[PDB]
């Protein structure tokens, strides 16, 4: 049976970067050649593996994480990066083995009146650990003490993107799929074709 | 974050040979593609060389093909740029870059293609 990469990449709805979603992929045959499109994926970086050699490889499990960031924020999806997205939303470790894929989705995520449904977290008491996830929505205060939003020095930690069909490539929405390749000294359940 | 530090700059006579070096002090680059860039005065930054994480592939610019040689040693966490037969056109500040191993080889020209860029070291050919 083919690995359900179609259920991940060219799907339907994508989550916000702060509430990124992971799909575990196991017990299937992976044909990565369906991703071998240079003009589709403006980002097709791999770390610790070669993209052209993915079909010859076998892995214990494959994980796919999905989310959306604006164009200028795609560069923050990389090992050891700093910034509001890499530190507070989706953090990759330095020893990350896998690939990072992104493509412009202005035609489906940007509207003329502006789509503000995609959010990101911009305040947090401490950076995220690699592959950690924070979906909380508690009002933020620099002193850590609880506070009710309308007060002073109290801020909602989530901010939304502004996706419009009139802006340049840097502010257009991009969908990102991060693939992690696991080697856990178990039977290999995701292998290439034939 | 990631600090790319170049080493081994200086001034060489034409037709000599000088080897550059780049390391991240505390951050491992074993999974990273590493390369070199060049900024000749008055001109924008030029690509020079690039090598994958396990050195399965390496790419050079047409200007420095054959005389420049990129290599890496993941045990020392270092990338090197052997520069032989240097011309007065090689006078520039040489930058070290780190980034992902791209599926398309053309995607090796700064911008989003490279994640990190060093401060640069000056090589001049008298």
């Amino acid at each position, epitope marked *: 049976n083919l690995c359900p990469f179609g259920e991940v990449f060219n799907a339907t709805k994508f989550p916000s970067v702060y509430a990124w979603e992971r799909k575990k992929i196991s017990n299937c045959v992976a044909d990565y050649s369906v991703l071998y499109n240079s003009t589709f994926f403006s980002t097709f970086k791999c770390y*610790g*593996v*070669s993209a052209t*050699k993915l*079909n*010859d*490889l*076998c892995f214990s499990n494959v994980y796919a994480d999905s989310f959306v960031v604006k164009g200028d924020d795609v560069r923050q999806i990389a090992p050891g990066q700093t910034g509001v997205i890499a530190d507070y939303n989706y953090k990759l470790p330095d020893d990350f083995m896998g690939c990072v894929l992104a493509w412009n989705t202005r035609n489906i995520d940007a509207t003329s009146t502006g789509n503000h449904n995609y959010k990101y977290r911009y305040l947090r008491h401490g950076k995220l650990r690699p592959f950690e996830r924070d979906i909380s929505n508690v009002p933020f205060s620099p002193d850590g003490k609880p506070c009710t939003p309308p007060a002073l020095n109290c801020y909602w930690p989530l901010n939304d993107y502004g996706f419009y069909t009139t802006t340049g490539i840097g502010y257009q929405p991009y969908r990102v799929v991060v693939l992690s390749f696991e*080697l856990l*000294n*178990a*039977p*290999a359940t995701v*292998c*290439g*074709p*034939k | 974050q990631v600090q790319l530090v170049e080493s081994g700059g200086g001034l060489v006579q034409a037709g000599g040979s000088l080897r550059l070096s780049c390391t991240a002090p505390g951050r491992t680059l074993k999974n990273f593609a590493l390369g070199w860039f060049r900024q000749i005065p008055g001109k924008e930054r030029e690509f020079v060389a690039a090598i994958t994480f*396990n*050195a*399965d*592939s390496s790419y050079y610019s047409d200007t420095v093909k054959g005389r420049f040689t990129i290599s890496r040693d993941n045990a020392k966490n270092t990338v090197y740029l052997q520069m032989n037969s240097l011309k007065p056109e090689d006078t520039a500040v040489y930058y070290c870059v780190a980034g992902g191993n791209h599926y398309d080889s053309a995607r090796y020209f700064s911008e989003r293609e490279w994640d990190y860029l060093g401060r640069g070291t000056q090589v001049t050919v008298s």
Partner: nanobody
Amino acid sequence: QVQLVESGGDLVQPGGSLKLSCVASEGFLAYYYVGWFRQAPGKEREGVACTSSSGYSTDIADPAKGRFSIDRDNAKNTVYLQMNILKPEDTAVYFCAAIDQMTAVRSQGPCSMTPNDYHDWGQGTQVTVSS
């Protein structure tokens, strides 16, 4: 560490066919590139067949191209070598060898048919074909 045990050697007559099996005890073989090698009497070890972890890239040596075929079954931790049109020149002990993937990927090409690259070896199996 992975251990390899070949099997299937026998006496064949010219034109016959044989099928050897390289089964990996202990560690799982799916994470390894696997090559088939043979050693004729008085001769150096020579690469015969070649496969990647998934079997997506394979190779067959020139004296066996068009006659020998390689396949694997990672569910059974085994790599197979299918020999056909066996000629007396194929009389040798046949070895299988495993090199860990990512290490094998460092080299370009489908896979390695070079004995010095694999390092891990099995005990071999003798294949004799009559005149």
